Amino acid sequence: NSVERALEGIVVCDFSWVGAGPIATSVLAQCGADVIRIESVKRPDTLRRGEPFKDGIGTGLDRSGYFAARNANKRDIALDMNHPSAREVAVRLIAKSDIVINNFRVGQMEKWKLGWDEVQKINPRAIYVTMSMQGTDGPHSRYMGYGVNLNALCGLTARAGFAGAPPFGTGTNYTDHVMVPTHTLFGIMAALLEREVTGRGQTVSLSQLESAISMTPSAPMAFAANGEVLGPQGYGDAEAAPHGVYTTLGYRKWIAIAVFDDAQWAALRRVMGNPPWAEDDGFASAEMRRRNAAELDERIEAWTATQYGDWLMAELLKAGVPAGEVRDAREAIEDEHLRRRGFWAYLDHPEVGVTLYNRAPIVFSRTPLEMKTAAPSIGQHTREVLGGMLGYSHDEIENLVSHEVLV
Amino acid sequence: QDFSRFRVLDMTGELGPYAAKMFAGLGADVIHVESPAGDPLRRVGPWFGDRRDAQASLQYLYYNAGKRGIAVDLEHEAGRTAFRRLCDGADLLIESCRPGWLDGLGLSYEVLSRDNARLVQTSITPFGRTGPLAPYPGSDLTCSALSGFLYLAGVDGDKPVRAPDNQAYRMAEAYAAVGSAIALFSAQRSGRGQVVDVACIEAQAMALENAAQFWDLEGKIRRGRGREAGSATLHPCADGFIALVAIMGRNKPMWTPFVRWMEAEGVEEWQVLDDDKWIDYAYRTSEEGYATFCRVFERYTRTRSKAYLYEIGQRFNVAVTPVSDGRDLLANPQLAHRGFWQTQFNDTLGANVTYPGAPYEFGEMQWRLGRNAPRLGEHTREVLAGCGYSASEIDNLVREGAVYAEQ
């Protein structure tokens, strides 16, 4: 029974402990990499104390789904890195690691003598990954921010809102979730690919602001080209018409409908029963539907409001019209499509029982992602790693953890 | 020599192109494949000035910089033969075709990799190559709706707003570049490529923050952030909006600097904020807590510019950022210090174009913008010659409409 994993044998020394770092290494762990989190019991990941918790009971450090969902498949060793004997342990691990990633305050790894200069000598194959809000030098290099702050700073939030209203953003700390982790992962993989040739690791460094702007080009490009700020457009579109969010029957129920050409508009008319109003010259062309968008939306919503959105979505899709119910998290969890795709995965955990996780959004035809173990507790693998991978004697292990260098 | 040894075919449109751009940015030989009708991204804005022609789409120019361009009609037997020869010499094919289309033309993965076992084929689609939604059309809005992501961009019963720059597409493309690189790495070692299937609906489900766990663990449906006083809240100021994270959880050490900022600036009623009730999430999300916070803070913010609040809030060690517009972005002194903005003369347009720059830095690899995005069929001739076609065979292909070469 031979399972093939794309990153078989890859070892990750993972000091990262909030934000995008752990999201990136979650993906590596699903590809067969051995991701070993370094987590001090004195300095636990703050998400461990963040809701949601199993049954809303936030006791201890192993009940948060905020923490758990980003940490499946990982091993966890409890190292106190400001204890001298802990450095020697990290050195042994770095000597065996393909990837070293961290979020410590600028200059901290250097203070521990674990910067790139020293890591390159411990292991010239090691790839050394760091990130910052917006770069480690320059006038704003000491500034502080979270994902929601970067949504704002990168230009996304100003263009995520209704025209004439306060902007909203995504409602989430979005830059942390995909923008930053995918660029981190691509940089890691690029370094791994180059290392197949050169035999050398190298540094990979990310400014989170620059990764975010790179996926939101229109705001700055339109201003640079045309000297005018490109405003937000609500749930409209610059080309599609009609294009919007419309009420259907039930509590906070909406359907998204997006029409891109006259054939799709004829199909929407067909599904609507070909009401005479929709035959007006004012809606005959994409250009006129854009011009008359406000009236068009009112007339569409008057009709959708009488319909069940699941039935209407199905009828529109079967007519070739892009449509989709505006799903809440329960509807996404229960979706036939995501479940048939195997996106959602349930994993057993010794304290919270069976709970919901998901694989990364990649279906590999030969080396598929795997979901094997729930998020680890602090120090769950300390003895296993120290003894099995890092070569410490039983006596040395118990000495390291009786003196509470490791827990 | 960086990624120059990798050949990437990129058959993408409005959906798909950022993934091949990431390969191009590290120096890969990337060939954008269009039909003779032209990449549809050429026909969507925003635009360079008042131009609306095939080279005027700022998105087209951005996502397809660093690529050569060919035009092939895969509806033509001869075109399918040229495409097969191109794939025989490719490390990677990225495409966003409708599920089933290439298979129906006799261009399945098995056919494309028959004499190229290492070929990686990455498919970027709204719903995946398989499953009950695979037959059906999707767009940025409707994927966002179906994934759960769109619903989070509002509160209470308010309709949600869209994220800019087609984030359904961008999230899939970023994960598709990652999956492509992982499969390429695996192919370097095994001699075997595979199919990499990345669906927008799954990629966006990666961006639900903790909404899925709120349902699984607590039976709660969440929507967007923005109504927890001082925690990921947006506030009007004299010339726009700012984003604030003054506290999360019960983290009073975050809050105290914020109170000191208010005191130092002489803000009316600042003492209202100097109270441990603000350390409680339940109070911060209460109607009176949120309203009182906004009353006190916005009396101050409305009198000050984005730039002033950014400067002074960060001086006090509070996570404040501007809701930057395009003008703010081009003027940002940190991005200027970092040399982020890349300006490249465009001969087709007869003007300089400014683009976002590098999302990451490497010790040994160099990011680059690469060449201006191709005109339709700009490199059809030179690329087919590269695959062993002579002039006469190529002239045959043009005259029969199997490929299109520019003037």
PDB file of N, CA and C in Angstrom, chain A residues 53 55 134 137-140 144 149 152-153 171 173-174 183 194 196 200 202-203 205 210-211 214-218 226 234 236-237 239 245 301 318 325 327 337 341 356 359 363 365-367, chain B residues 2 5 18 45 47 49 62 127 130 133 136 145 156 159 162 165 167 171 174 189 194-195 197 202 209 216-218 222 225 243 310 314 319 321-322 324 334 337-338 359 361 363-365:
ATOM      1  N   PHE A  53     -14.655  28.008  20.397  1.00  0.00           N
ATOM      2  CA  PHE A  53     -14.223  26.861  21.172  1.00  0.00           C
ATOM      3  C   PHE A  53     -15.271  25.763  21.050  1.00  0.00           C
ATOM      4  N   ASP A  55     -18.126  23.761  21.898  1.00  0.00           N
ATOM      5  CA  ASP A  55     -19.274  24.031  22.764  1.00  0.00           C
ATOM      6  C   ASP A  55     -19.180  25.366  23.520  1.00  0.00           C
ATOM      7  N   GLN A 134       5.739  45.324   6.194  1.00  0.00           N
ATOM      8  CA  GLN A 134       5.982  46.124   5.002  1.00  0.00           C
ATOM      9  C   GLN A 134       7.466  46.363   4.747  1.00  0.00           C
ATOM     10  N   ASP A 137      13.301  47.685   6.670  1.00  0.00           N
ATOM     11  CA  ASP A 137      13.901  49.011   6.754  1.00  0.00           C
ATOM     12  C   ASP A 137      13.007  49.999   5.998  1.00  0.00           C
ATOM     13  N   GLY A 138      13.215  51.290   6.271  1.00  0.00           N
ATOM     14  CA  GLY A 138      12.363  52.313   5.703  1.00  0.00           C
ATOM     15  C   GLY A 138      11.501  53.008   6.740  1.00  0.00           C
ATOM     16  N   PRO A 139      10.825  54.084   6.341  1.00  0.00           N
ATOM     17  CA  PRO A 139      10.207  54.971   7.344  1.00  0.00           C
ATOM     18  C   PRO A 139       9.073  54.335   8.110  1.00  0.00           C
ATOM     19  N   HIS A 140       8.416  53.321   7.565  1.00  0.00           N
ATOM     20  CA  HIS A 140       7.289  52.681   8.229  1.00  0.00           C
ATOM     21  C   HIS A 140       7.649  51.258   8.666  1.00  0.00           C
ATOM     22  N   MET A 144       3.053  48.735  13.160  1.00  0.00           N
ATOM     23  CA  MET A 144       2.328  47.554  13.608  1.00  0.00           C
ATOM     24  C   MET A 144       0.999  47.428  12.865  1.00  0.00           C
ATOM     25  N   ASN A 149      -5.683  45.658   9.064  1.00  0.00           N
ATOM     26  CA  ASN A 149      -4.906  46.878   8.805  1.00  0.00           C
ATOM     27  C   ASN A 149      -4.292  46.834   7.410  1.00  0.00           C
ATOM     28  N   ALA A 152      -6.674  47.516   4.609  1.00  0.00           N
ATOM     29  CA  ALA A 152      -6.805  48.960   4.452  1.00  0.00           C
ATOM     30  C   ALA A 152      -5.574  49.567   3.761  1.00  0.00           C
ATOM     31  N   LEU A 153      -4.374  49.267   4.268  1.00  0.00           N
ATOM     32  CA  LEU A 153      -3.147  49.872   3.739  1.00  0.00           C
ATOM     33  C   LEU A 153      -2.863  49.489   2.287  1.00  0.00           C
ATOM     34  N   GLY A 171     -14.588  41.955   5.821  1.00  0.00           N
ATOM     35  CA  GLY A 171     -15.096  41.464   7.087  1.00  0.00           C
ATOM     36  C   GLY A 171     -14.142  40.544   7.812  1.00  0.00           C
ATOM     37  N   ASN A 173      -9.618  39.382   8.408  1.00  0.00           N
ATOM     38  CA  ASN A 173      -8.186  39.728   8.319  1.00  0.00           C
ATOM     39  C   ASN A 173      -7.570  39.122   7.062  1.00  0.00           C
ATOM     40  N   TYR A 174      -8.133  39.488   5.911  1.00  0.00           N
ATOM     41  CA  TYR A 174      -7.971  38.703   4.683  1.00  0.00           C
ATOM     42  C   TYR A 174      -6.525  38.488   4.262  1.00  0.00           C
ATOM     43  N   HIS A 183       2.078  33.377  -1.337  1.00  0.00           N
ATOM     44  CA  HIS A 183       3.360  33.893  -1.778  1.00  0.00           C
ATOM     45  C   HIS A 183       4.509  33.306  -0.952  1.00  0.00           C
ATOM     46  N   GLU A 194      15.230  25.608  -6.929  1.00  0.00           N
ATOM     47  CA  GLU A 194      16.586  26.059  -7.215  1.00  0.00           C
ATOM     48  C   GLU A 194      17.613  25.183  -6.502  1.00  0.00           C
ATOM     49  N   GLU A 196      17.509  22.031  -5.859  1.00  0.00           N
ATOM     50  CA  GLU A 196      17.758  20.793  -6.605  1.00  0.00           C
ATOM     51  C   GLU A 196      18.946  20.945  -7.545  1.00  0.00           C
ATOM     52  N   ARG A 200      22.140  24.468  -2.678  1.00  0.00           N
ATOM     53  CA  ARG A 200      22.205  25.473  -1.634  1.00  0.00           C
ATOM     54  C   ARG A 200      20.816  25.978  -1.312  1.00  0.00           C
ATOM     55  N   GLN A 202      18.659  29.266   0.403  1.00  0.00           N
ATOM     56  CA  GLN A 202      18.768  30.722   0.324  1.00  0.00           C
ATOM     57  C   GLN A 202      17.663  31.323   1.188  1.00  0.00           C
ATOM     58  N   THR A 203      17.747  32.633   1.415  1.00  0.00           N
ATOM     59  CA  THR A 203      16.710  33.336   2.151  1.00  0.00           C
ATOM     60  C   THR A 203      15.511  33.627   1.260  1.00  0.00           C
ATOM     61  N   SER A 205      12.151  36.260   1.779  1.00  0.00           N
ATOM     62  CA  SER A 205      11.651  37.336   2.629  1.00  0.00           C
ATOM     63  C   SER A 205      10.418  37.944   1.981  1.00  0.00           C
ATOM     64  N   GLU A 210       3.312  44.274   0.247  1.00  0.00           N
ATOM     65  CA  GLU A 210       3.609  44.122  -1.177  1.00  0.00           C
ATOM     66  C   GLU A 210       2.985  42.859  -1.745  1.00  0.00           C
ATOM     67  N   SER A 211       2.908  41.786  -0.970  1.00  0.00           N
ATOM     68  CA  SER A 211       2.171  40.621  -1.442  1.00  0.00           C
ATOM     69  C   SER A 211       0.699  40.946  -1.659  1.00  0.00           C
ATOM     70  N   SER A 214       0.005  43.129  -4.754  1.00  0.00           N
ATOM     71  CA  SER A 214       0.229  42.371  -5.981  1.00  0.00           C
ATOM     72  C   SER A 214      -1.020  41.640  -6.454  1.00  0.00           C
ATOM     73  N   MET A 215      -1.975  41.350  -5.568  1.00  0.00           N
ATOM     74  CA  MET A 215      -3.246  40.717  -5.951  1.00  0.00           C
ATOM     75  C   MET A 215      -4.385  41.725  -6.011  1.00  0.00           C
ATOM     76  N   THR A 216      -4.107  43.014  -5.814  1.00  0.00           N
ATOM     77  CA  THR A 216      -5.124  44.068  -5.917  1.00  0.00           C
ATOM     78  C   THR A 216      -4.581  45.208  -6.792  1.00  0.00           C
ATOM     79  N   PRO A 217      -4.241  44.918  -8.065  1.00  0.00           N
ATOM     80  CA  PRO A 217      -3.524  45.926  -8.879  1.00  0.00           C
ATOM     81  C   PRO A 217      -4.350  47.106  -9.354  1.00  0.00           C
ATOM     82  N   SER A 218      -5.682  47.008  -9.413  1.00  0.00           N
ATOM     83  CA  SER A 218      -6.453  48.021 -10.144  1.00  0.00           C
ATOM     84  C   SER A 218      -6.377  49.388  -9.471  1.00  0.00           C
ATOM     85  N   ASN A 226      -4.222  57.110 -14.985  1.00  0.00           N
ATOM     86  CA  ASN A 226      -5.277  58.047 -15.337  1.00  0.00           C
ATOM     87  C   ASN A 226      -5.412  59.220 -14.389  1.00  0.00           C
ATOM     88  N   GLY A 234     -19.676  48.408  -4.832  1.00  0.00           N
ATOM     89  CA  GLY A 234     -20.732  47.639  -4.173  1.00  0.00           C
ATOM     90  C   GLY A 234     -20.708  46.171  -4.556  1.00  0.00           C
ATOM     91  N   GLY A 236     -21.926  45.520  -7.770  1.00  0.00           N
ATOM     92  CA  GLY A 236     -21.965  45.643  -9.219  1.00  0.00           C
ATOM     93  C   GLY A 236     -20.670  45.226  -9.875  1.00  0.00           C
ATOM     94  N   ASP A 237     -20.637  45.402 -11.192  1.00  0.00           N
ATOM     95  CA  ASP A 237     -19.485  45.070 -12.011  1.00  0.00           C
ATOM     96  C   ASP A 237     -19.369  46.091 -13.134  1.00  0.00           C
ATOM     97  N   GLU A 239     -18.433  45.493 -16.239  1.00  0.00           N
ATOM     98  CA  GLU A 239     -18.813  44.952 -17.536  1.00  0.00           C
ATOM     99  C   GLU A 239     -20.114  44.171 -17.493  1.00  0.00           C
ATOM    100  N   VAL A 245     -26.651  41.165  -6.194  1.00  0.00           N
ATOM    101  CA  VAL A 245     -27.093  40.367  -5.044  1.00  0.00           C
ATOM    102  C   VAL A 245     -28.558  40.713  -4.810  1.00  0.00           C
ATOM    103  N   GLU A 301     -34.969  42.051  -8.503  1.00  0.00           N
ATOM    104  CA  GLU A 301     -35.200  41.700  -7.095  1.00  0.00           C
ATOM    105  C   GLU A 301     -36.690  41.519  -6.802  1.00  0.00           C
ATOM    106  N   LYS A 318     -28.467  25.702 -14.971  1.00  0.00           N
ATOM    107  CA  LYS A 318     -28.866  24.811 -16.064  1.00  0.00           C
ATOM    108  C   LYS A 318     -29.224  25.545 -17.346  1.00  0.00           C
ATOM    109  N   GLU A 325     -26.311  30.995  -4.703  1.00  0.00           N
ATOM    110  CA  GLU A 325     -26.783  31.469  -3.406  1.00  0.00           C
ATOM    111  C   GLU A 325     -25.643  32.052  -2.559  1.00  0.00           C
ATOM    112  N   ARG A 327     -24.026  31.963   0.415  1.00  0.00           N
ATOM    113  CA  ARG A 327     -24.017  30.950   1.477  1.00  0.00           C
ATOM    114  C   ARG A 327     -23.375  31.413   2.774  1.00  0.00           C
ATOM    115  N   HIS A 337     -21.318  19.835  -3.128  1.00  0.00           N
ATOM    116  CA  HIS A 337     -20.152  19.914  -3.989  1.00  0.00           C
ATOM    117  C   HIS A 337     -18.851  19.833  -3.188  1.00  0.00           C
ATOM    118  N   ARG A 341     -16.187  16.733  -3.220  1.00  0.00           N
ATOM    119  CA  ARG A 341     -14.797  16.996  -3.552  1.00  0.00           C
ATOM    120  C   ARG A 341     -13.841  16.586  -2.442  1.00  0.00           C
ATOM    121  N   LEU A 356     -14.335  19.726  12.705  1.00  0.00           N
ATOM    122  CA  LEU A 356     -14.194  20.073  11.301  1.00  0.00           C
ATOM    123  C   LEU A 356     -12.883  20.782  10.982  1.00  0.00           C
ATOM    124  N   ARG A 359      -8.886  20.397   3.891  1.00  0.00           N
ATOM    125  CA  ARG A 359      -7.622  20.366   3.165  1.00  0.00           C
ATOM    126  C   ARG A 359      -7.431  21.690   2.421  1.00  0.00           C
ATOM    127  N   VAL A 363      -6.426  19.573  -5.618  1.00  0.00           N
ATOM    128  CA  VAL A 363      -6.653  18.140  -5.804  1.00  0.00           C
ATOM    129  C   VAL A 363      -5.560  17.662  -6.763  1.00  0.00           C
ATOM    130  N   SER A 365      -3.679  14.715  -8.743  1.00  0.00           N
ATOM    131  CA  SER A 365      -4.148  13.432  -9.252  1.00  0.00           C
ATOM    132  C   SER A 365      -3.256  12.264  -8.834  1.00  0.00           C
ATOM    133  N   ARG A 366      -1.996  12.509  -8.460  1.00  0.00           N
ATOM    134  CA  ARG A 366      -1.102  11.416  -8.086  1.00  0.00           C
ATOM    135  C   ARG A 366      -0.530  11.524  -6.676  1.00  0.00           C
ATOM    136  N   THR A 367      -0.334  12.732  -6.148  1.00  0.00           N
ATOM    137  CA  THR A 367       0.180  12.928  -4.795  1.00  0.00           C
ATOM    138  C   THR A 367      -0.809  13.770  -3.978  1.00  0.00           C
TER     139      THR A 367
ATOM    140  N   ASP B   2      18.203  30.912 -12.695  1.00  0.00           N
ATOM    141  CA  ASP B   2      16.886  31.171 -12.116  1.00  0.00           C
ATOM    142  C   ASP B   2      15.913  30.173 -12.734  1.00  0.00           C
ATOM    143  N   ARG B   5      15.122  27.603 -17.075  1.00  0.00           N
ATOM    144  CA  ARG B   5      15.067  26.239 -17.582  1.00  0.00           C
ATOM    145  C   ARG B   5      13.652  25.670 -17.643  1.00  0.00           C
ATOM    146  N   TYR B  18      -2.565  35.095 -13.043  1.00  0.00           N
ATOM    147  CA  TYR B  18      -1.561  35.451 -12.040  1.00  0.00           C
ATOM    148  C   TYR B  18      -0.640  34.263 -11.744  1.00  0.00           C
ATOM    149  N   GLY B  45     -11.981  46.369 -17.995  1.00  0.00           N
ATOM    150  CA  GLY B  45     -11.265  47.493 -17.433  1.00  0.00           C
ATOM    151  C   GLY B  45     -10.862  47.233 -16.001  1.00  0.00           C
ATOM    152  N   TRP B  47      -8.940  50.884 -17.566  1.00  0.00           N
ATOM    153  CA  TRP B  47      -8.334  51.087 -18.865  1.00  0.00           C
ATOM    154  C   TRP B  47      -7.243  52.151 -18.828  1.00  0.00           C
ATOM    155  N   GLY B  49      -6.312  55.328 -19.976  1.00  0.00           N
ATOM    156  CA  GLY B  49      -6.939  56.501 -20.567  1.00  0.00           C
ATOM    157  C   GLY B  49      -8.322  56.198 -21.106  1.00  0.00           C
ATOM    158  N   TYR B  62      -0.989  43.822 -16.716  1.00  0.00           N
ATOM    159  CA  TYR B  62      -0.346  43.422 -15.461  1.00  0.00           C
ATOM    160  C   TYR B  62      -0.175  41.913 -15.375  1.00  0.00           C
ATOM    161  N   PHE B 127     -15.212  25.732 -10.059  1.00  0.00           N
ATOM    162  CA  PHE B 127     -15.692  24.721  -9.132  1.00  0.00           C
ATOM    163  C   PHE B 127     -14.861  23.450  -9.129  1.00  0.00           C
ATOM    164  N   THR B 130     -14.237  18.334 -11.408  1.00  0.00           N
ATOM    165  CA  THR B 130     -15.129  17.234 -11.070  1.00  0.00           C
ATOM    166  C   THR B 130     -16.122  17.713 -10.014  1.00  0.00           C
ATOM    167  N   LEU B 133     -20.998  20.619  -9.310  1.00  0.00           N
ATOM    168  CA  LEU B 133     -21.003  21.951  -9.918  1.00  0.00           C
ATOM    169  C   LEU B 133     -20.097  22.057 -11.146  1.00  0.00           C
ATOM    170  N   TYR B 136     -21.145  23.584 -14.595  1.00  0.00           N
ATOM    171  CA  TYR B 136     -21.904  24.834 -14.571  1.00  0.00           C
ATOM    172  C   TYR B 136     -21.019  26.080 -14.477  1.00  0.00           C
ATOM    173  N   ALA B 145     -20.028  34.049  -3.646  1.00  0.00           N
ATOM    174  CA  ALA B 145     -21.285  33.711  -2.983  1.00  0.00           C
ATOM    175  C   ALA B 145     -21.290  32.267  -2.497  1.00  0.00           C
ATOM    176  N   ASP B 156     -25.177  42.040  10.129  1.00  0.00           N
ATOM    177  CA  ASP B 156     -26.606  41.965  10.403  1.00  0.00           C
ATOM    178  C   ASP B 156     -27.324  41.564   9.115  1.00  0.00           C
ATOM    179  N   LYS B 159     -26.851  43.569   2.821  1.00  0.00           N
ATOM    180  CA  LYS B 159     -26.213  42.871   1.709  1.00  0.00           C
ATOM    181  C   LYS B 159     -24.705  43.057   1.733  1.00  0.00           C
ATOM    182  N   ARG B 162     -18.492  43.337  -2.615  1.00  0.00           N
ATOM    183  CA  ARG B 162     -17.439  42.591  -3.260  1.00  0.00           C
ATOM    184  C   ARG B 162     -16.056  43.089  -2.890  1.00  0.00           C
ATOM    185  N   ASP B 165     -10.831  43.406  -7.686  1.00  0.00           N
ATOM    186  CA  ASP B 165      -9.822  42.679  -8.456  1.00  0.00           C
ATOM    187  C   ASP B 165     -10.060  41.173  -8.419  1.00  0.00           C
ATOM    188  N   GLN B 167     -11.160  38.633  -6.462  1.00  0.00           N
ATOM    189  CA  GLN B 167     -10.409  37.809  -5.509  1.00  0.00           C
ATOM    190  C   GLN B 167     -10.745  36.310  -5.584  1.00  0.00           C
ATOM    191  N   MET B 171      -7.397  34.227  -5.618  1.00  0.00           N
ATOM    192  CA  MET B 171      -7.100  33.189  -4.632  1.00  0.00           C
ATOM    193  C   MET B 171      -6.851  31.843  -5.307  1.00  0.00           C
ATOM    194  N   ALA B 174      -3.355  32.030  -7.030  1.00  0.00           N
ATOM    195  CA  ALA B 174      -2.221  31.947  -6.108  1.00  0.00           C
ATOM    196  C   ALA B 174      -2.014  30.508  -5.638  1.00  0.00           C
ATOM    197  N   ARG B 189      11.803  15.057  -9.099  1.00  0.00           N
ATOM    198  CA  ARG B 189      12.363  13.917  -8.374  1.00  0.00           C
ATOM    199  C   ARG B 189      11.843  12.577  -8.876  1.00  0.00           C
ATOM    200  N   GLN B 194       1.592  15.313 -13.170  1.00  0.00           N
ATOM    201  CA  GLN B 194       0.243  14.964 -12.746  1.00  0.00           C
ATOM    202  C   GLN B 194      -0.667  16.131 -13.084  1.00  0.00           C
ATOM    203  N   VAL B 195      -1.948  15.984 -12.743  1.00  0.00           N
ATOM    204  CA  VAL B 195      -2.921  17.069 -12.837  1.00  0.00           C
ATOM    205  C   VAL B 195      -3.051  17.751 -11.486  1.00  0.00           C
ATOM    206  N   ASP B 197      -5.612  20.382  -9.697  1.00  0.00           N
ATOM    207  CA  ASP B 197      -6.974  20.874  -9.877  1.00  0.00           C
ATOM    208  C   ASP B 197      -7.274  21.862  -8.749  1.00  0.00           C
ATOM    209  N   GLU B 202     -13.200  26.343  -3.625  1.00  0.00           N
ATOM    210  CA  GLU B 202     -12.391  25.830  -2.528  1.00  0.00           C
ATOM    211  C   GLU B 202     -11.382  26.863  -2.055  1.00  0.00           C
ATOM    212  N   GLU B 209     -11.870  32.722   7.499  1.00  0.00           N
ATOM    213  CA  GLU B 209     -11.319  33.086   8.797  1.00  0.00           C
ATOM    214  C   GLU B 209     -11.622  32.019   9.832  1.00  0.00           C
ATOM    215  N   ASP B 216     -19.303  24.554  13.236  1.00  0.00           N
ATOM    216  CA  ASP B 216     -19.041  23.189  13.704  1.00  0.00           C
ATOM    217  C   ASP B 216     -18.981  23.085  15.230  1.00  0.00           C
ATOM    218  N   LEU B 217     -18.349  24.069  15.880  1.00  0.00           N
ATOM    219  CA  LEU B 217     -18.043  23.981  17.312  1.00  0.00           C
ATOM    220  C   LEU B 217     -19.141  24.563  18.180  1.00  0.00           C
ATOM    221  N   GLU B 218     -19.831  25.596  17.708  1.00  0.00           N
ATOM    222  CA  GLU B 218     -20.750  26.359  18.543  1.00  0.00           C
ATOM    223  C   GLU B 218     -22.122  26.586  17.920  1.00  0.00           C
ATOM    224  N   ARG B 222     -21.471  33.468  11.763  1.00  0.00           N
ATOM    225  CA  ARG B 222     -20.870  34.794  11.849  1.00  0.00           C
ATOM    226  C   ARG B 222     -20.938  35.496  10.498  1.00  0.00           C
ATOM    227  N   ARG B 225     -16.365  41.276  10.544  1.00  0.00           N
ATOM    228  CA  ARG B 225     -15.861  42.218  11.548  1.00  0.00           C
ATOM    229  C   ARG B 225     -16.282  43.645  11.181  1.00  0.00           C
ATOM    230  N   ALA B 243      -8.423  52.310   9.680  1.00  0.00           N
ATOM    231  CA  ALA B 243      -8.648  50.996  10.267  1.00  0.00           C
ATOM    232  C   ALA B 243      -7.895  50.900  11.579  1.00  0.00           C
ATOM    233  N   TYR B 310      -2.374  58.058  10.951  1.00  0.00           N
ATOM    234  CA  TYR B 310      -1.389  56.992  10.757  1.00  0.00           C
ATOM    235  C   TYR B 310      -0.112  57.316  11.495  1.00  0.00           C
ATOM    236  N   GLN B 314       0.595  55.409  15.136  1.00  0.00           N
ATOM    237  CA  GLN B 314       1.733  54.511  15.194  1.00  0.00           C
ATOM    238  C   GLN B 314       2.789  55.026  16.148  1.00  0.00           C
ATOM    239  N   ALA B 319      -2.077  49.935  16.435  1.00  0.00           N
ATOM    240  CA  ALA B 319      -2.242  49.410  15.080  1.00  0.00           C
ATOM    241  C   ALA B 319      -3.344  50.167  14.346  1.00  0.00           C
ATOM    242  N   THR B 321      -4.045  52.037  10.506  1.00  0.00           N
ATOM    243  CA  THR B 321      -3.617  52.275   9.123  1.00  0.00           C
ATOM    244  C   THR B 321      -4.672  53.049   8.359  1.00  0.00           C
ATOM    245  N   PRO B 322      -4.276  53.768   7.330  1.00  0.00           N
ATOM    246  CA  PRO B 322      -5.236  54.426   6.461  1.00  0.00           C
ATOM    247  C   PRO B 322      -5.927  53.427   5.566  1.00  0.00           C
ATOM    248  N   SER B 324      -6.244  53.236   2.367  1.00  0.00           N
ATOM    249  CA  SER B 324      -5.529  53.894   1.300  1.00  0.00           C
ATOM    250  C   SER B 324      -6.289  53.838  -0.013  1.00  0.00           C
ATOM    251  N   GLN B 334       6.939  54.384   2.323  1.00  0.00           N
ATOM    252  CA  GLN B 334       7.561  53.088   2.555  1.00  0.00           C
ATOM    253  C   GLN B 334       7.694  52.312   1.257  1.00  0.00           C
ATOM    254  N   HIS B 337      10.527  53.940  -0.583  1.00  0.00           N
ATOM    255  CA  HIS B 337      11.803  53.481  -0.040  1.00  0.00           C
ATOM    256  C   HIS B 337      12.159  52.095  -0.558  1.00  0.00           C
ATOM    257  N   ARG B 338      11.159  51.217  -0.697  1.00  0.00           N
ATOM    258  CA  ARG B 338      11.385  49.835  -1.102  1.00  0.00           C
ATOM    259  C   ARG B 338      11.500  49.673  -2.611  1.00  0.00           C
ATOM    260  N   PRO B 359       6.416  40.700  -4.916  1.00  0.00           N
ATOM    261  CA  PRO B 359       5.781  40.302  -3.659  1.00  0.00           C
ATOM    262  C   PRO B 359       6.701  39.599  -2.673  1.00  0.00           C
ATOM    263  N   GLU B 361      11.288  38.678  -1.812  1.00  0.00           N
ATOM    264  CA  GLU B 361      12.713  38.834  -2.075  1.00  0.00           C
ATOM    265  C   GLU B 361      13.461  37.545  -1.751  1.00  0.00           C
ATOM    266  N   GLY B 363      17.509  35.591  -1.517  1.00  0.00           N
ATOM    267  CA  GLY B 363      18.951  35.765  -1.451  1.00  0.00           C
ATOM    268  C   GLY B 363      19.652  35.595  -2.780  1.00  0.00           C
ATOM    269  N   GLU B 364      19.148  34.709  -3.639  1.00  0.00           N
ATOM    270  CA  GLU B 364      19.851  34.417  -4.883  1.00  0.00           C
ATOM    271  C   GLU B 364      19.018  34.638  -6.131  1.00  0.00           C
ATOM    272  N   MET B 365      17.711  34.462  -6.069  1.00  0.00           N
ATOM    273  CA  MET B 365      16.900  34.687  -7.249  1.00  0.00           C
ATOM    274  C   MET B 365      16.516  36.157  -7.325  1.00  0.00           C
TER     275      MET B 365
END
